[PDB]
Short mmCIF file of all heavy atoms in Angstrom, two decimals:
data_model
loop_
_atom_site.label_atom_id
_atom_site.label_comp_id
_atom_site.label_asym_id
_atom_site.label_seq_id
_atom_site.Cartn_x
_atom_site.Cartn_y
_atom_site.Cartn_z
N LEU A 1 36.12 -11.50 -19.81
CA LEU A 1 37.27 -10.90 -19.19
C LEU A 1 38.30 -10.52 -20.27
O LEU A 1 39.35 -11.17 -20.41
CB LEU A 1 37.95 -11.81 -18.19
CG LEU A 1 37.27 -11.93 -16.83
CD1 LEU A 1 35.96 -12.67 -16.95
CD2 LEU A 1 38.21 -12.64 -15.83
N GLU A 2 37.97 -9.53 -21.11
CA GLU A 2 38.78 -9.16 -22.23
C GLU A 2 40.18 -8.72 -21.70
O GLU A 2 40.29 -8.03 -20.68
CB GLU A 2 38.21 -8.06 -23.06
CG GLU A 2 39.10 -7.70 -24.19
CD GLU A 2 39.41 -8.93 -25.06
OE1 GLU A 2 38.59 -9.87 -25.09
OE2 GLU A 2 40.48 -8.88 -25.68
N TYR A 3 41.21 -9.13 -22.42
CA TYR A 3 42.58 -8.99 -21.94
C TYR A 3 43.51 -8.25 -22.91
O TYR A 3 44.57 -8.80 -23.16
CB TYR A 3 43.11 -10.38 -21.61
CG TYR A 3 42.58 -10.99 -20.34
CD1 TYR A 3 42.60 -12.39 -20.12
CD2 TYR A 3 42.01 -10.20 -19.35
CE1 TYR A 3 42.08 -12.89 -18.95
CE2 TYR A 3 41.50 -10.71 -18.19
CZ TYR A 3 41.55 -12.08 -18.00
OH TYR A 3 41.02 -12.62 -16.82
N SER A 4 43.11 -7.10 -23.42
CA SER A 4 43.83 -6.24 -24.39
C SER A 4 43.76 -6.79 -25.79
O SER A 4 44.29 -6.14 -26.68
CB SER A 4 45.34 -6.16 -23.94
OG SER A 4 46.05 -5.38 -24.91
N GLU A 5 43.07 -7.89 -26.01
CA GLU A 5 42.91 -8.39 -27.31
C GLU A 5 41.75 -7.74 -28.02
O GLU A 5 41.78 -7.49 -29.25
CB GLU A 5 42.70 -9.90 -27.34
CG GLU A 5 42.52 -10.50 -28.74
CD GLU A 5 42.36 -11.97 -28.66
OE1 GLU A 5 42.31 -12.60 -27.57
OE2 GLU A 5 42.22 -12.60 -29.77
N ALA A 6 40.70 -7.34 -27.26
CA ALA A 6 39.56 -6.68 -27.92
C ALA A 6 39.32 -5.29 -27.43
O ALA A 6 38.42 -4.62 -27.85
CB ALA A 6 38.28 -7.53 -27.71
N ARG A 7 40.19 -4.82 -26.48
CA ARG A 7 40.14 -3.39 -26.23
C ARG A 7 40.71 -2.64 -27.43
O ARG A 7 40.29 -1.49 -27.74
CB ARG A 7 40.94 -3.06 -24.98
CG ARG A 7 42.46 -3.32 -25.11
CD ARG A 7 43.20 -2.81 -23.88
NE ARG A 7 44.60 -3.16 -23.92
CZ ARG A 7 45.51 -2.41 -24.53
NH1 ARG A 7 45.15 -1.33 -25.18
NH2 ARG A 7 46.79 -2.82 -24.53
N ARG A 8 41.64 -3.25 -28.18
CA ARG A 8 42.15 -2.69 -29.43
C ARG A 8 41.10 -2.68 -30.46
O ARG A 8 41.04 -1.72 -31.28
CB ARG A 8 43.35 -3.49 -29.88
CG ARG A 8 42.98 -4.95 -30.25
CD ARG A 8 44.22 -5.71 -30.73
NE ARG A 8 43.93 -7.11 -30.98
CZ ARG A 8 43.48 -7.58 -32.18
NH1 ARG A 8 43.26 -6.77 -33.14
NH2 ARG A 8 43.24 -8.90 -32.32
N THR A 9 40.21 -3.65 -30.56
CA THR A 9 39.06 -3.62 -31.49
C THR A 9 37.96 -2.73 -30.97
O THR A 9 37.08 -2.36 -31.74
CB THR A 9 38.56 -4.98 -31.76
OG1 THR A 9 37.60 -4.93 -32.84
CG2 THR A 9 37.88 -5.62 -30.57
N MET A 10 37.93 -2.43 -29.63
CA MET A 10 37.01 -1.39 -29.19
C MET A 10 37.47 -0.04 -29.63
O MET A 10 36.60 0.75 -30.16
CB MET A 10 36.94 -1.50 -27.65
CG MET A 10 36.24 -2.74 -27.09
SD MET A 10 34.54 -2.86 -27.57
CE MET A 10 33.82 -1.59 -26.59
N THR A 11 38.71 0.29 -29.42
CA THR A 11 39.27 1.51 -30.00
C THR A 11 39.09 1.52 -31.51
O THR A 11 38.75 2.55 -32.08
CB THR A 11 40.72 1.66 -29.63
OG1 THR A 11 40.88 1.69 -28.22
CG2 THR A 11 41.31 2.94 -30.25
N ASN A 12 39.30 0.36 -32.15
CA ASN A 12 39.07 0.25 -33.59
C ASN A 12 37.71 0.62 -33.98
O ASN A 12 37.50 1.48 -34.90
CB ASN A 12 39.47 -1.14 -34.04
CG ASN A 12 39.57 -1.30 -35.54
OD1 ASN A 12 39.37 -0.31 -36.28
ND2 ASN A 12 39.87 -2.43 -36.03
N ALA A 13 36.72 0.04 -33.35
CA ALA A 13 35.33 0.30 -33.70
C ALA A 13 34.96 1.73 -33.41
O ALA A 13 34.29 2.39 -34.21
CB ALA A 13 34.41 -0.64 -32.96
N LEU A 14 35.39 2.27 -32.29
CA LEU A 14 35.09 3.64 -31.96
C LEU A 14 35.70 4.62 -32.94
O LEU A 14 35.14 5.71 -33.19
CB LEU A 14 35.56 4.01 -30.50
CG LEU A 14 35.27 5.41 -30.01
CD1 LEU A 14 33.78 5.61 -29.93
CD2 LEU A 14 35.95 5.64 -28.68
N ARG A 15 36.85 4.29 -33.53
CA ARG A 15 37.52 5.13 -34.46
C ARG A 15 37.18 4.84 -35.92
O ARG A 15 37.64 5.57 -36.83
CB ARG A 15 39.03 5.05 -34.29
CG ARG A 15 39.61 3.69 -34.69
CD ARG A 15 41.09 3.65 -34.46
NE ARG A 15 41.64 2.32 -34.74
CZ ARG A 15 41.99 1.89 -35.97
NH1 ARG A 15 41.87 2.67 -36.98
NH2 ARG A 15 42.51 0.66 -36.09
N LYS A 16 36.36 3.81 -36.18
CA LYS A 16 36.05 3.46 -37.58
C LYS A 16 34.97 4.35 -38.09
O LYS A 16 35.18 5.06 -39.09
CB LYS A 16 35.68 2.03 -37.70
CG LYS A 16 35.35 1.65 -39.14
CD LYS A 16 35.08 0.17 -39.30
CE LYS A 16 34.60 -0.12 -40.70
NZ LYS A 16 35.64 0.18 -41.73
N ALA A 17 33.78 4.32 -37.51
CA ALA A 17 32.63 5.09 -37.98
C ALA A 17 32.12 5.97 -36.85
O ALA A 17 31.04 5.71 -36.31
CB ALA A 17 31.58 4.18 -38.52
N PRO A 18 32.81 7.08 -36.49
CA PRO A 18 32.27 8.06 -35.57
C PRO A 18 31.65 9.25 -36.22
O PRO A 18 31.25 10.17 -35.50
CB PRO A 18 33.56 8.46 -34.83
CG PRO A 18 34.59 8.45 -35.88
CD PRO A 18 34.24 7.27 -36.79
N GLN A 19 31.44 9.24 -37.52
CA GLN A 19 31.06 10.44 -38.28
C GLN A 19 29.70 10.94 -37.96
O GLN A 19 29.41 12.09 -38.27
CB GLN A 19 31.16 10.11 -39.78
CG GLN A 19 32.54 9.81 -40.25
CD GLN A 19 33.49 10.95 -40.09
OE1 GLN A 19 33.08 12.11 -40.34
NE2 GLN A 19 34.68 10.68 -39.65
N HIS A 20 28.85 10.14 -37.29
CA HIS A 20 27.53 10.59 -36.87
C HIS A 20 27.62 11.59 -35.74
O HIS A 20 28.72 12.06 -35.41
CB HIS A 20 26.65 9.41 -36.46
CG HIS A 20 26.35 8.48 -37.57
ND1 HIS A 20 25.43 8.78 -38.62
CD2 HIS A 20 26.79 7.23 -37.85
CE1 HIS A 20 25.39 7.76 -39.44
NE2 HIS A 20 26.18 6.82 -39.05
N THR A 21 26.52 11.94 -35.12
CA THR A 21 26.52 12.84 -33.97
C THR A 21 25.66 12.17 -32.87
O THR A 21 24.49 12.35 -32.78
CB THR A 21 25.82 14.18 -34.40
OG1 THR A 21 24.45 13.97 -34.74
CG2 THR A 21 26.57 14.80 -35.57
N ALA A 22 26.35 11.36 -32.06
CA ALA A 22 25.74 10.72 -30.93
C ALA A 22 24.57 9.81 -31.32
O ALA A 22 23.41 10.10 -30.94
CB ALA A 22 25.35 11.71 -29.86
N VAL A 23 24.84 8.77 -32.11
CA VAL A 23 23.79 7.93 -32.66
C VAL A 23 22.93 7.28 -31.55
O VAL A 23 21.81 6.88 -31.78
CB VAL A 23 24.34 6.86 -33.62
CG1 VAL A 23 25.28 5.95 -32.87
CG2 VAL A 23 23.22 6.13 -34.28
N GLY A 24 23.52 7.11 -30.35
CA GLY A 24 22.78 6.59 -29.22
C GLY A 24 23.41 5.27 -28.66
O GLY A 24 23.44 5.10 -27.42
N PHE A 25 23.85 4.43 -29.53
CA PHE A 25 24.74 3.33 -29.12
C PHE A 25 26.20 3.77 -29.16
O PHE A 25 27.05 3.13 -28.48
CB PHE A 25 24.49 2.10 -29.97
CG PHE A 25 24.76 2.27 -31.43
CD1 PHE A 25 26.02 2.04 -31.98
CD2 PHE A 25 23.75 2.75 -32.26
CE1 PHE A 25 26.22 2.25 -33.32
CE2 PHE A 25 23.99 2.90 -33.65
CZ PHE A 25 25.20 2.68 -34.15
N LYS A 26 26.52 4.78 -29.95
CA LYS A 26 27.87 5.35 -29.98
C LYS A 26 28.26 5.86 -28.59
O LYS A 26 29.40 5.77 -28.20
CB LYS A 26 27.92 6.43 -30.99
CG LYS A 26 29.32 7.08 -31.07
CD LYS A 26 29.33 8.10 -32.28
CE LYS A 26 30.63 8.87 -32.21
NZ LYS A 26 31.80 7.94 -32.37
N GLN A 27 27.31 6.37 -27.83
CA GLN A 27 27.58 6.74 -26.45
C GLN A 27 27.92 5.52 -25.59
O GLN A 27 28.70 5.64 -24.61
CB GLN A 27 26.42 7.46 -25.85
CG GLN A 27 26.07 8.76 -26.58
CD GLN A 27 27.16 9.77 -26.41
OE1 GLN A 27 27.75 9.95 -25.35
NE2 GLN A 27 27.43 10.51 -27.46
N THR A 28 27.36 4.38 -25.91
CA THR A 28 27.63 3.14 -25.14
C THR A 28 28.98 2.55 -25.52
O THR A 28 29.62 1.97 -24.65
CB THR A 28 26.50 2.15 -25.35
OG1 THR A 28 25.27 2.70 -24.89
CG2 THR A 28 26.80 0.88 -24.63
N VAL A 29 29.35 2.58 -26.79
CA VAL A 29 30.70 2.20 -27.10
C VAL A 29 31.73 3.15 -26.52
O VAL A 29 32.75 2.67 -26.00
CB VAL A 29 30.86 2.03 -28.65
CG1 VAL A 29 30.49 3.37 -29.32
CG2 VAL A 29 32.26 1.68 -29.00
N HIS A 30 31.49 4.44 -26.60
CA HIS A 30 32.35 5.41 -25.98
C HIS A 30 32.47 5.26 -24.49
O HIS A 30 33.48 5.53 -23.91
CB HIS A 30 31.98 6.81 -26.39
CG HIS A 30 32.88 7.86 -25.91
ND1 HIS A 30 34.15 8.05 -26.48
CD2 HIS A 30 32.76 8.80 -24.97
CE1 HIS A 30 34.75 9.07 -25.85
NE2 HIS A 30 33.93 9.51 -24.92
N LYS A 31 31.37 4.76 -23.88
CA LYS A 31 31.34 4.59 -22.43
C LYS A 31 32.05 3.29 -22.03
O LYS A 31 32.90 3.33 -21.13
CB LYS A 31 29.89 4.62 -21.91
CG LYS A 31 29.77 4.59 -20.38
CD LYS A 31 28.32 4.47 -19.97
CE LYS A 31 27.61 5.83 -20.15
NZ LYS A 31 26.21 5.78 -19.65
N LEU A 32 31.67 2.15 -22.63
CA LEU A 32 32.18 0.90 -22.30
C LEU A 32 33.59 0.64 -22.80
O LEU A 32 34.19 -0.36 -22.38
CB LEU A 32 31.24 -0.18 -22.83
CG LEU A 32 31.60 -1.64 -22.56
CD1 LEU A 32 31.61 -1.93 -21.02
CD2 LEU A 32 30.67 -2.59 -23.30
N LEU A 33 34.08 1.49 -23.68
CA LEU A 33 35.36 1.16 -24.36
C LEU A 33 36.51 1.11 -23.34
O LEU A 33 37.18 0.08 -23.19
CB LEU A 33 35.68 2.18 -25.46
CG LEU A 33 36.84 1.89 -26.39
CD1 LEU A 33 36.57 2.55 -27.71
CD2 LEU A 33 38.13 2.41 -25.80
N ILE A 34 36.82 2.25 -22.67
CA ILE A 34 37.96 2.29 -21.80
C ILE A 34 37.62 1.74 -20.40
O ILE A 34 38.49 1.70 -19.50
CB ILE A 34 38.52 3.73 -21.67
CG1 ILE A 34 37.39 4.67 -21.14
CG2 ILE A 34 39.02 4.21 -23.02
CD1 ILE A 34 37.94 6.02 -20.72
N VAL A 35 36.37 1.27 -20.25
CA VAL A 35 36.05 0.58 -19.00
C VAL A 35 36.94 -0.69 -18.92
O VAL A 35 37.51 -1.02 -17.90
CB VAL A 35 34.57 0.22 -18.98
CG1 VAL A 35 34.27 -0.63 -17.74
CG2 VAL A 35 33.71 1.49 -18.99
N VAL A 36 37.02 -1.50 -20.03
CA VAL A 36 37.78 -2.72 -20.04
C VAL A 36 39.28 -2.35 -19.95
O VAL A 36 40.06 -3.12 -19.32
CB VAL A 36 37.44 -3.52 -21.27
CG1 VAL A 36 36.02 -3.87 -21.28
CG2 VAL A 36 37.82 -2.76 -22.55
N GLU A 37 39.69 -1.23 -20.58
CA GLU A 37 41.14 -0.88 -20.51
C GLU A 37 41.58 -0.46 -19.16
O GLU A 37 42.67 -0.83 -18.74
CB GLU A 37 41.41 0.21 -21.57
CG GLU A 37 41.19 -0.22 -23.02
CD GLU A 37 41.41 0.89 -23.99
OE1 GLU A 37 41.59 2.07 -23.56
OE2 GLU A 37 41.38 0.63 -25.23
N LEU A 38 40.70 0.26 -18.46
CA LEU A 38 40.94 0.53 -17.04
C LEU A 38 41.13 -0.74 -16.23
O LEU A 38 42.11 -0.87 -15.49
CB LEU A 38 39.75 1.28 -16.45
CG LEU A 38 39.52 2.72 -16.92
CD1 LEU A 38 38.23 3.25 -16.27
CD2 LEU A 38 40.67 3.59 -16.57
N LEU A 39 40.30 -1.75 -16.46
CA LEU A 39 40.48 -3.02 -15.83
C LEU A 39 41.72 -3.77 -16.28
O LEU A 39 42.25 -4.55 -15.50
CB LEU A 39 39.24 -3.92 -16.12
CG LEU A 39 37.93 -3.47 -15.50
CD1 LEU A 39 36.78 -4.37 -15.93
CD2 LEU A 39 38.02 -3.43 -14.00
N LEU A 40 42.21 -3.49 -17.47
CA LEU A 40 43.39 -4.17 -17.95
C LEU A 40 44.72 -3.53 -17.53
O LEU A 40 45.37 -4.00 -16.60
CB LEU A 40 43.33 -4.29 -19.47
CG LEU A 40 42.24 -5.20 -19.98
CD1 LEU A 40 42.07 -4.97 -21.50
CD2 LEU A 40 42.61 -6.63 -19.68
N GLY A 41 45.08 -2.44 -18.17
CA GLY A 41 46.32 -1.80 -17.86
C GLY A 41 46.27 -0.30 -17.76
O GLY A 41 47.04 0.34 -17.01
N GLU A 42 45.38 0.34 -18.48
CA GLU A 42 45.41 1.78 -18.75
C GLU A 42 44.63 2.51 -17.66
O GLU A 42 43.73 1.90 -17.01
CB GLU A 42 44.83 2.12 -20.10
CG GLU A 42 45.71 1.66 -21.27
CD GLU A 42 45.48 0.21 -21.67
OE1 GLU A 42 44.57 -0.43 -21.05
OE2 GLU A 42 46.13 -0.30 -22.57
N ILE A 43 44.97 3.77 -17.41
CA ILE A 43 44.22 4.62 -16.50
C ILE A 43 43.89 5.96 -17.08
O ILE A 43 44.14 7.01 -16.39
CB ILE A 43 44.95 4.65 -15.14
CG1 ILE A 43 43.98 5.22 -14.06
CG2 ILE A 43 46.28 5.42 -15.22
CD1 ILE A 43 42.82 4.31 -13.72
N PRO A 44 43.40 6.09 -18.27
CA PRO A 44 42.99 7.39 -18.79
C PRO A 44 41.57 7.66 -18.37
O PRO A 44 40.77 6.74 -18.18
CB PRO A 44 43.09 7.31 -20.29
CG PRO A 44 42.73 5.93 -20.55
CD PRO A 44 43.28 5.09 -19.40
N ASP A 45 41.17 8.92 -18.26
CA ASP A 45 39.79 9.24 -17.96
C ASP A 45 39.00 9.18 -19.26
O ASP A 45 39.50 8.70 -20.28
CB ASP A 45 39.68 10.61 -17.28
CG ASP A 45 40.28 10.63 -15.94
OD1 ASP A 45 40.33 9.59 -15.27
OD2 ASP A 45 40.79 11.71 -15.51
N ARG A 46 37.81 9.74 -19.26
CA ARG A 46 37.00 9.75 -20.48
C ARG A 46 36.35 11.11 -20.63
O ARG A 46 35.12 11.21 -20.83
CB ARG A 46 35.97 8.57 -20.42
CG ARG A 46 35.29 8.17 -21.72
CD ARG A 46 33.89 8.84 -21.76
NE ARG A 46 33.16 8.39 -20.56
CZ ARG A 46 32.14 9.10 -20.04
NH1 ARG A 46 31.80 10.25 -20.59
NH2 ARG A 46 31.52 8.67 -18.91
#
């Protein structure tokens, strides 16, 4: 039940090494990232 402590490191990881082109797990980090933030406080789409 992540509580804004590791959603910041999710954004961090997504923004650290995105230089590839859809490596395959990058889609899963991009998918699961704001899932937790939606559950926490934020309501942006993807």
